């Protein structure tokens, strides 16, 4: 019999940006 | 084992923020959950050593180990 | 039986007395008992901020079981601290975590409400491989398990309210942040406990000081954790001061130095001097040992008094008859009166130390723990601080007004008198440049830290645009630099006592002045992530020259008062009426004069002497050369730096022109003599 | 159908406005600053709602909440 | 505490100003195109501030500076 | 095994930023916080290789291994 081996499980998250006008 | 040495051993960790999220897996045991009670009641004597940068980023996110 | 193998018997620790008797948490313990005595959803889980006693409630409940003062439905129960550690740590093979978990639940089912389950650290349970939630999420709302979780506020939201059914399997019990005086009472019970441990005495002004200071200065941790941080630390520190002494090491350095001197000389007299000093050192040594022994016996009889109190409470549990009156009327009055006899013996014989912990020691702990200087006015810093304006005229000549003002600011900080809603000095400098705004602030930093550019030096001339608000503050979540945070608030919360220069403040689009409306008003500012920073130990200083025409027009023939009033009108033309009310003091610089220019001439000469002494060369100056530098460095409109450009050119160009010429020799005084109208450099 | 006190204060400068709000906080909860002092002098841009409210999923501070 | 020298040259055009500066660079490194040349006549609006010193957090080209 | 080599071995790595972000999984350990100890003592004779921009983005994020 064998054992339930542990994993590594690479995960990821993201970013927004932001653009900004000028008035004139 | 360190309970079996009775405060004769000051534990030292360099780069403490390897410990928050040390081995979180299918079993999310993290090595922060396990050290948290011994660190609370002062049973160990663990001295960390961390950068001022990653103290913010990687340890102030885990507020109970703050 | 897994209960032997995979929990903690907390009732045994409370039985063997390994715990802190919790004062208070009346409503929340009674709330725990309310929620546990139900039929479905028999599971509360304590929620508060980390620190406020989410372990304390469960241990105080457990002692009340041991004290038996519970409501009758909880008599005879058991409190078992569920070990996620070993119950995961065995689980190597497949199914083992689930098998041990099942066997735990079957063994607790076999006890039938005899055992109140206590999960410590609830979020450790959930991810363990279905695997850990959906085994017990059935068994939770069937009454057969009485679990009391205890976990943080954040891990509730992030590790529980994800899986919403697991969330409805519980009851929130909102553990509050404890208040001021409740923290005081908690500290009194624990004062008795740390006077068991750390072999010292604790004063009651130490208690009110730890409460007042932890609530006031620090922001990061919470009551009553950090008041215990103060008290426990000061206990260890005073333990070290008794354990160590300064006069002994002074005399020890003296006797070893005179011993080395007499060994080098082998007229004498130093055998006699060394014998007298060794006798004095042995006398102070024996006094030190006698004082330590007196405090040692005091603590032994203090601890035996405490164990007598423990044993008579064991009698109140069991009910021994003669033991009650025996232990009381014998052991309490005689040991308390000889404890006080040892106390007044300490008050007689302690000469060389401190046996207690007072507000002085809490203040010393707090300043050496954070860095806000609230410790008592020790003598050397008091002498330095009384010599404020003696020192400030060694980097700023003239301009006495703001010199006095910042003198007042540092005083009313260190004397403690200032208003603790607001920062120390929210100053604002005016006056046309070349007069020493930036230099007054640099002189402050060197005064306060022994460092010139160790100050949070925001430079306001970048903030002409509408978005360097979120330069300084932080970047709000979802956006790019969220994970950094700002440059102001981060560099203040690293070191809560520093001087924010705001050089050249008029440049900005006035949104930055909305940010400073918060800053100067109440000293809290919110960073990007949302965690506030307390500015109430900082000296926010802003320089500007929005009064150039005015003060250059009318500094003569006017006072300081109408000066201030008219330039205040001019700032009201520029700045906002919302804002100049928040200023600590609108101060007005003024253009310099000839004695001042001669002073700055000498200062630049002295630092130049230092620079060429790092080169290794000696320089004298003719007084007529000083007249050249004075009349070459004078003007009304530009202030100081005409002097610096004149010094720079009319010294350093012919001088260093001669230096790399190899004309000049290391070893001669480079005397600065004059020609008709130019400095001549001679070598003799 | 509405929150209780939907107040808006006005007037000249420095005249006890924030004081009245701390006076309520001192009344209702016996604590001068125990009140959510969200300061509308940070929110001079569009993305500042994402400061105070929270973040849409997948992105940076989404799991911390606002 | 000040940079090495900060000079304001003047004149009519085409007399050698840019050549003095390029003569310095072609001295100091033997290169005209090893210097920093910020063509300040572009900067006719108040934005190119935020091209030379960089754009603050929460904006577009954040991680590449000015 | 390089400690076995008695200081007679020079380690060469190209794309050192890749090694910085090599094992950095979500709550794991990379080579960055494992070569933090063997390089401040420096028994491991590393030799680096990088592009200038991605040095700035990648390694200068991690100040200790900077
Ligand atoms: N009412 C109280 N009486 C006595 N000690 C208390 C009380 N409240 C808190 N403490 C002390 O505060 C410390 C722990 O308090 P807690 O509120 O349990 O913080 P914590 O629960 O340990 O934090 P976590 O996140 O649960 S590890 C211990 O030193 C307790 O003695
Ligand atoms: N009272 C003074 N004592 C000594 N040095 C001074 C004094 N006033 C100016 N200086 C010198 O002048 C320089 C600083 O000029 P400042 O008056 O500080 O210009 P500023 O105050 O920064 O105002 P602006 O905005 O820069 S024009 C330093 O090199 C100082 O050594
Ligand atoms: N009736 C009052 N009783 C006591 N103090 C008052 C009274 N009116 C004003 N104050 C004081 O005025 C100051 C008010 O601070 P703030 O509330 O920020 O000012 P505000 O006038 O309410 O509006 P802003 O935000 O300052 S423009 C405090 O220092 C109060 O002590
Ligand atoms: N004194 C000079 N020695 C050598 N070449 C020169 C000299 N003056 C002008 N030149 C040449 O003519 C060009 C014009 O000089 P520039 O300095 O570029 O013009 P300018 O005087 O700087 O005015 P700008 O910069 O164009 S507004 C140079 O690029 C050289 O090719």
Q: What string of DSSP letters covers C334-363?
A: HHHHHHHHHHHHHHHH------S--HHHHH
E58 contact C CB<8A: yes
CA–CA separation, E5 and E17 (whole Å): 16
Length of chain F in terms of residues written: 66
Say how many C-beta atoms besides its own lie within 10 A of residue C424's C-beta: 25
φ/ψ of residue A5, rounded to 5: -75, 150
Dihedral, CA of residue D49, residue D50, residue D51 and residue D57, to nearest 10: 150
Q: In angstroms, what CA-CA distances link C458 with D41, D44, E1?
A: 19, 20, 17
Considering only CB atoms, which chain C residues are within 8 Å of A13?
none
Q: Which ligand is the nearest neighbour of the Cα of D15?
A: 3
SS3 C672: strand
From E10, E11, E18, E38, mutation site for ligand 4 pocket: most ligand atoms within 8 A of C-beta:
E18
From C521, C524, C583, mutation site for ligand 3 pocket: most ligand atoms within 8 A of C-beta:
C521
CA–CA separation, F17 and C537 (whole Å): 41
CB-based contacts of F55, cutoff 8 Å, min separation 6:
F17
Closest by CA position to C650, among listed C684, C613, C622? C622
Identify the residue whose C-alpha is closest to ligand 2 atom 26. C433
Considering only CB atoms, which chain B residues are within 8 Å of A9?
25-26
SS3 B22: coil
Q: With b meaning 16 or more CB within 10 Å and e meaning fewer, what string describes C90-102?
A: ebeeeeebbebbe
CA–CA separation, C365 and C359 (whole Å): 10
Q: In angstroms, what CA-CA distances link C584 with A24, C431, C492, C540?
A: 36, 17, 20, 9
CA–CA separation, C211 and F1 (whole Å): 56
Structure tokens at C222: 């919470």
Angle in degrees, 0-180, between the axes of helices C204-216 and C359-369, rounded to the nearest 10 = 30
Q: In angstroms, what CA-CA distances link D41 with C57, C261, C608, E9?
A: 40, 70, 47, 43
CA–CA separation, A2 and C211 (whole Å): 57
φ/ψ of residue C664, rounded to 5: -100, 150
CA–CA separation, C278 and C274 (whole Å): 6
Sign of the CA dihedral with C265 first, then C271, C276, and C281 last: positive
Q: Given the DSSP bridges, would you call strands C115-119 and C78-82 parallel, antiparallel or unpaired? A: parallel
Q: Given the DSSP bridges, would you call strands C532-534 and C541-543 parallel, antiparallel or unpaired? A: unpaired
Structure tokens at C85: 């550690």
Q: Chains contacting E with at least 3 CB pairs below 8 Å?
A: A, C
Mutate to test the interface with A, among D46, D48, D55 (most CBs of A within 10 A): D46
Contact C514, D44 (CB under 8 A): yes
CA–CA separation, C635 and C593 (whole Å): 9
For ligand 3, the distance from its centroid to the CA atom of residue C526, given in whole angstroms, is 22
- Before C224, cis peptide (omega within 30)? yes
Length of chain A in terms of residues written: 24
Question: Which residues have C-beta atoms less than 6 Å from ligand 3?
Answer: C 521; D 13-19
Q: Given the DSSP bridges, would you call strands C78-82 and C501-503 parallel, antiparallel or unpaired? A: unpaired
DSSP code string of C406-453: HHHHHHHHHTS-S-TTS-S--EEEES-SSSSHHHHHHHHHHHHHS-SS
For ligand 2, the distance from its centroid to the CA atom of residue C600, given in whole angstroms, is 10
SS3 C456: coil
Contact C129, B25 (CB under 8 A): no
Beta carbon of C404 within 6 Å of any ligand 1 atom: no
Contact C329, C175 (CB under 8 A): no
SS3 C682: strand
CB-based contacts of C24, cutoff 8 Å, min separation 6:
C178, C182, C185, C186
Whether there are 3 or more C-beta pairs closer than 8 Å between A and D is yes
The DSSP bridge partners found for residue C503 are C459
Structure tokens at C215: 């609530």
CB-based contacts of C540, cutoff 8 Å, min separation 6:
C423, C425, C426, C427, C500, C502, C516, C519, C520
User: What stretch of H or E contains C585?
Assistant: strand C585-588
DSSP code string of C599-639: HHHHHHHHHHHHHHHHHT-EEEE-HHHHHHHHHTS--SSS-
Q: Output the 3-class SS for C12-68.
A: HHHHCCCCCCCCCCHHHHHHHHHHHCCCCCCCEEEECCCCCCCCHHHHHHHHHHHHC
Closest by CA position to D51, among listed C156, C465, A18? A18
Closest by CA position to C398, among listed C407, C389, C406? C389
Structure tokens at C520: 């100067």
Contact C544, C506 (CB under 8 A): yes
For ligand 3, the distance from its centroid to the CA atom of residue C520, given in whole angstroms, is 14
CB-based contacts of C320, cutoff 8 Å, min separation 6:
none
CA–CA separation, C124 and C138 (whole Å): 19
CA-based end-to-end distance of chain B: 25
Beta carbon of C56 within 6 Å of any ligand 1 atom: yes
Helices (H), C72-203: 84-89, 96-111, 123-126, 136-140, 153-159, 164-168, 180-197
CA–CA separation, C591 and C398 (whole Å): 10
From chain F residues 11-50, the ones with a CB under 8 A of any chain A CB are 25-26, 28
CB-based contacts of C60, cutoff 8 Å, min separation 6:
C21, C22, C25, C29
From chain C residues 473-502, the ones with a CB under 8 A of any chain B CB are 483, 485, 490, 494
Angle in degrees, 0-180, between the axes of helices C180-197 and C270-318, rounded to the nearest 10 = 110
Our CA angle for B26, B29, B30, nearest 5°, is: 105
Contact D24, D18 (CB under 8 A): no
Say how many C-beta atoms besides its own lie within 10 A of residue C487's C-beta: 16
Strand order in the sheet with C585-588: C457-459, C501-503, C541-543, C427-430, C585-588
B61 contact C CB<8A: no
CA–CA separation, B57 and C412 (whole Å): 36
Contact C114, C77 (CB under 8 A): yes
CA–CA separation, C79 and C146 (whole Å): 10
Beta carbon of B24 within 6 Å of any ligand 1 atom: no
Reported resolution in A? 4.2
φ/ψ of residue A2, rounded to 5: -120, 175
SS3 C305: helix
From chain B residues 4-23, the ones with a CB under 8 A of any chain C CB are none
Closest by CA position to C566, among listed C430, C404, C414, C405? C430
Tell me the HSE value of C19 on the side-chain side, using a 13 A CA sphere: 22
Nearest CA of chain E to the CA of C471: how many Å?
5
CB-based contacts of C176, cutoff 8 Å, min separation 6:
C28, C48, C52
Our CA angle for D45, D46, D52, nearest 5°, is: 90
Nearest CA of chain D to the CA of C427: how many Å?
18
CA–CA separation, E61 and C277 (whole Å): 72
CA–CA separation, C37 and C427 (whole Å): 60
Length of chain D in terms of residues written: 66
Q: In angstroms, what CA-CA distances link C435 with C550, C554, C654, D55?
A: 15, 16, 28, 49
- The method recorded for this entry reads cryo-EM
User: What stretch of H or E contains C548?
Assistant: helix C548-554
SS3 C111: helix
Ligand 4 atom index nearest CA of E13: 23
């Amino acid at each position: 019999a064998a054992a339930a081996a542990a994993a590594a499980a690479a995960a990821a998250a993201a970013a927004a940006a932001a653009a900004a006008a000028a008035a004139a | 084992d360190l309970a079996k040495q009775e405060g004769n051993v000051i534990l030292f960790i360099d780069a403490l923020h390897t410990m928050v999220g040390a081995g979180k897996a299918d079993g999310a045991m993290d090595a922060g959950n396990m050290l948290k009670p011994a660190l609370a009641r002062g049973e160990l004597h663990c001295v960390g050593a961390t950068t001022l940068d990653e103290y913010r980023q990687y340890i102030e996110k885990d507020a109970a180990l703050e | 039986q897994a209960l032997k193998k995979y929990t903690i018997d907390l009732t045994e620790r409370a039985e063997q007395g390994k715990l802190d008797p919790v004062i208070g948490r009346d409503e929340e313990i009674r709330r725990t008992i309310q929620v546990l005595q139900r039929r479905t959803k028999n599971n509360p889980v304590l929620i508060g901020e980390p620190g406020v006693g989410k372990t304390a409630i469960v241990e105080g409940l457990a002692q009340r079981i041991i004290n038996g003062e519970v409501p009758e439905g909880l008599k005879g129960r058991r409190v078992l601290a569920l070990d996620m550690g070993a119950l995961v740590a065995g689980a190597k093979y497949r199914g083992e975590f689930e098998e041990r978990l099942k066997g735990v639940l079957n063994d607790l089912a076999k006890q039938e409400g005899n055992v109140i389950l206590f999960i410590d650290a609830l979020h450790t349970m959930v991810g363990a491989g279905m695997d850990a939630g959906n085994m017990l999420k059935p068994a939770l709302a069937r009454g057969e398990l009485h679990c009391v979780g205890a976990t943080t506020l954040d891990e509730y939201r992030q590790y529980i309210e994800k899986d919403a059914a697991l969330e409805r399997r519980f009851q929130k019990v909102f553990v509050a942040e404890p208040s001021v005086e409740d923290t005081i009472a908690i500290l009194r019970g624990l004062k008795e406990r740390y006077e068991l441990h750390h072999h010292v005495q604790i004063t009651d002004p130490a208690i009110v000081a730890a409460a007042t200071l932890s609530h006031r200065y620090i922001a990061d941790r919470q009551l009553p954790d950090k008041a215990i941080d103060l008290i426990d630390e000061a206990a260890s520190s005073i333990r070290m001061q008794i354990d160590s002494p300064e006069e002994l090491d002074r005399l020890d350095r003296r006797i070893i130095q005179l011993k080395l001197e007499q060994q080098a000389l082998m007229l004498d007299m130093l055998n006699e001097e060394l014998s007298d000093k060794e006798r004095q050192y042995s006398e102070l040594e024996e006094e030190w040992k006698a004082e330590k022994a007196s405090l040692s016996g005091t603590q032994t009889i203090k601890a035996e008094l405490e164990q007598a109190k423990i044993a008579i409470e064991q009698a109140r549990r069991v009910g021994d008859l003669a033991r009650m009156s025996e232990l009381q009327y014998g052991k309490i009055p005689e040991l308390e009166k000889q404890l006080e006899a040892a106390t007044q013996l300490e008050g007689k014989t302690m000469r060389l130390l401190r046996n207690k912990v007072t507000d002085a020691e809490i203040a010393e702990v707090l300043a050496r723990w954070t860095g806000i200087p609230v410790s008592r006015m020790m003598e050397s810093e008091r002498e330095k601080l009384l010599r404020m304006e003696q020192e400030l005229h060694h980097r700023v000549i003239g301009q006495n007004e703001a010199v006095d003002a910042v003198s007042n600011a540092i005083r009313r900080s260190r004397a403690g008198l200032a208003d603790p809603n607001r920062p120390i000095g929210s100053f604002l400098f005016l006056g046309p440049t070349g007069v020493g705004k930036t230099e007054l602030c640099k002189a402050l930093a060197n005064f306060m830290f022994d460092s010139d550019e160790a100050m949070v030096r925001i430079d306001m001339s970048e903030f002409m645009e509408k978005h360097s608000v979120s330069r300084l503050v932080g970047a709000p979540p979802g956006y790019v630099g969220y994970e950094e945070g700002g440059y102001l608030t981060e560099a203040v919360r690293r070191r809560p006592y520093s001087v924010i220069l705001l050089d050249a403040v008029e440049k900005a689009h006035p949104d930055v002045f909305n940010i400073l409306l918060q800053v100067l008003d109440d000293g809290r500012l919110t960073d990007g992530q949302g965690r506030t920073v307390d500015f109430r130990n900082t000296v926010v200083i802003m320089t500007s020259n929005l009064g150039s025409d005015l003060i250059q027009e009318r500094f003569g023939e006017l006072d300081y008062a109408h000066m201030k009033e008219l330039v205040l009108g001019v700032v009201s033309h520029n700045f906002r009426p919302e804002f100049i009310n928040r200023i600590d003091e609108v101060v007005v610089f003024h253009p310099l004069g000839e004695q001042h220019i001669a002073s700055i001439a000498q200062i630049q000469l002295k630092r130049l002497y230092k620079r060429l002494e790092e080169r290794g060369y000696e320089i004298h100056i003719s007084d007529e050369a000083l007249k050249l530098l004075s009349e070459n460095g004078y003007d009304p409109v530009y202030g100081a730096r005409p002097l610096k450009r004149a010094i720079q050119q009319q010294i350093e160009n012919p001088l260093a022109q001669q230096i790399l010429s190899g004309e000049l020799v290391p070893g001669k005084v480079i005397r600065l003599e004059v020609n008709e109208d130019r400095i001549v450099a001679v070598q003799h």
